[PDB]
Structure 1
Amino acid sequence: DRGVNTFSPEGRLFQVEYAIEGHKLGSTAIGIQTSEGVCLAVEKRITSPLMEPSSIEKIVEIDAHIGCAMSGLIADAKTLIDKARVETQNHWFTYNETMTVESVTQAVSNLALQFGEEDADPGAMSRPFGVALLFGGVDEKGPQLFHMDPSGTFVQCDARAIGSASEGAQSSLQEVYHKSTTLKEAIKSSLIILKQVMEEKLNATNIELATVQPGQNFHMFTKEELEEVIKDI
């Protein structure tokens, strides 16, 4: 046998190459930075009407003006989000004003790769998480969308997609989405791209949208708002 910790002759670690694949398994999430605000769209993709569609969430709040859509293993991401909630309010106690998209994202990413399978502390990871997070909000600086990877490489984006359609969708965004496309048009761009990975057509019970716009706090779109974008796709 050989370990998993080892570097391969390719020049990459095994555990990490697997973790990227974990991102690819889940549901697709689109986070678009427009200069009118930042919208995050995610597919519900429900298979049963007995479910209550409000409680299927994959947009969770890091902050009260930053929203986050997450992709890959839904469970694995949730822990990172739990630690993020404590930091944003903590930031309020110390600085006396609310956390930025950049500050929160770099701090979670340090934890992302730490892995030592044997002879490493139980207060530290044995394996990396297979989640890609999309932190999208507008903060003191302005609309910012930052993308976080399970490899712990953070980069600033304007349009990013992650999940099963991740490479396909990301290329397709670069095409339609530009900074000569308005916020409502970003919502239309995401909906079209969403359909190949979805098993059915787009509906207001099969998307969840939330936009954080200047001068406003995070709003979870209501059934009427979801339905107005459904009418024209």
Structure 2
Amino acid sequence: DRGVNTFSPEGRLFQVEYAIEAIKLGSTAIGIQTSEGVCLAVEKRITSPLMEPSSIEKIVEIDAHIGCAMSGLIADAKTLIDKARVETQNHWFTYNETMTVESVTQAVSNLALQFGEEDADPGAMSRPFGVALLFGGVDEKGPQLFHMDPSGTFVQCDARAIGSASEGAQSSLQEVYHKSMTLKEAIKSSLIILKQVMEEKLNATNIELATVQPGQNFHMFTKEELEEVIKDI
């Protein structure tokens, strides 16, 4: 047995490396950055038909211009999203403007290695957040997509996949994506790759689709408009 802030002979913390392993058991999520918006796709993974599919939400809005997709431990993620929602409103209160996608991601990345036993507050963190996040939104620089992991290393991505079949979905994204594709092609490509990595067949009450574009605000696809892009199998 050892402490939480213990370095390995390799050159990295144990608790952080085990938190990366925790994502590999979670559900898969695909995000694609386009010149005319950012789309986010995720599987609901319904265990029993008795459970309500509308209750399972893995894509949530931080602001009216930024959406976020989560993978791994859902319980720990909702603490990070709630903190991100406050930070956007704190910046709005002080500066009278909406935050950039990079700034919101950086704000969550500050709570990365803030765990410890000694020299900490009575209600401080004891373990890292085992959550991989996809920050997709539109600001003054345009449509942007960011990836974050338990280590706190955030980076801009054109196409990123996180979850159980992360290696299989990423390889499929490498051979389809190019710089000058459309948003309709981005939603189409994400769904074809999403059904390939799934164990259960793709359905309207099985997936979540959300698009953030320079035109309108954060939009959640309802069952009716989902079937409009599902008909093109």
**Which band: TM-score by shorter chain?**
over 0.9
Q: Distance in 2 between matches of 1:52 and 1:31?
A: 25
Q: CA RMSD in A?
A: 1.6
Cα offsets for 1:166-196 (capped at 9, x unmatched): 2322232122122232211112222222234
Preserved contact between residue 84 and residue 108 of structure 1 (Cα < 8 Å): yes
Unaligned runs of 5+ residues in structure 1 are none
Q: Distance in 2 between matches of 1:76 and 1:18?
A: 15
Q: How many residues are treated as equivalent by the alignment?
A: 233
Structure 1 range deviating more: 53-62 or 121-130: 121-130
Structure 1 range deviating more: 119-128 or 54-63: 119-128
1:24 is the counterpart of 2:24: yes
Question: Which aligned runs of 4 or more in structure 1 are off by greater than 6 angstroms?
Answer: none
Structure 1 range deviating more: 187-196 or 156-165: 187-196
Unaligned runs of 5+ residues in structure 2 are none
Shift of 1:152: 0.3
1:134 is paired with a residue whose SS is: strand
Shift of 1:85: 0.9
Preserved contact between residue 118 and residue 126 of structure 1 (Cα < 8 Å): no
Shift of 1:148: 1.0
Preserved contact between residue 169 and residue 197 of structure 2 (Cα < 8 Å): no
Structure 1 range deviating more: 77-86 or 108-117: 108-117
Shift of 1:51: 2.7
Identity %: 99
Q: Distance in 2 between matches of 1:175 and 1:73?
A: 30
What TM-score do you get using the length of structure 2 for normalisation? 0.94
Preserved contact between residue 31 and residue 160 of structure 2 (Cα < 8 Å): yes
Preserved contact between residue 4 and residue 127 of structure 2 (Cα < 8 Å): no
Change in CA separation of 1:10 and 1:198 when aligned onto 2, cut-off 3 Å:
same
Structure 1 range deviating more: 212-221 or 72-81: 212-221
Structure 1 range deviating more: 170-179 or 97-106: 170-179
What TM-score do you get using the length of structure 1 for normalisation? 0.94
The residue that corresponds to 1:102 in the other structure is 102
Q: Distance in 2 between matches of 1:136 and 1:122?
A: 34
Preserved contact between residue 117 and residue 127 of structure 1 (Cα < 8 Å): no
